[PDB]
Automatic annotation (TrEMBL), chain A:
This is Uncharacterized protein. It comes from Thermus thermophilus (strain ATCC 27634 / DSM 579 / HB8). It comes from the Bacteria. The chain holds residues 4 to 68 of 77 of the full protein.
Length: 65, 72
């Protein structure tokens, strides 16, 4: 009702992108875990779909599978 | 060519956002699951951090998200 266990299979390249994003977002004063990067990505995509941005890039990367 | 089982706890609001995004990106000709939306979000935000434009905004949303982890 308040929390949902998300199970997603990812590639090792997406794992590497997760690590690079986690380090890029981090700083000496704030630590960023991979799960926080996932939640932040979900929130950012939700906002962009609220604004309708980068749809050419969203479908470009989705068709890039 | 490895893979990785990923376990992440999310709020019900983000799960609903995941559903809405899954349907919005889907079509009768192509199905987009919630997990595929998660992968697309990962690659999208990683690319955004490589571009170096929206780092301030991502840090703000990140701060507010870390403010929500502590006991709702
Ligand atoms: La809630
Ligand atoms: La490999
Ligand atoms: La691979």
């Amino acid at each position: 009702k308040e929390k949902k266990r998300l199970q997603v299979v990812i590639s090792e390249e997406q794992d590497a992108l997760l690590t690079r994003a986690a380090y890029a977002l981090s700083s000496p004063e704030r630590a960023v875990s991979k799960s926080e990067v996932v939640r932040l990505a979900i929130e950012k995509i939700a906002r962009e779909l609220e604004e309708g941005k980068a749809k050419e890039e969203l479908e470009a990367l989705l068709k890039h599978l």
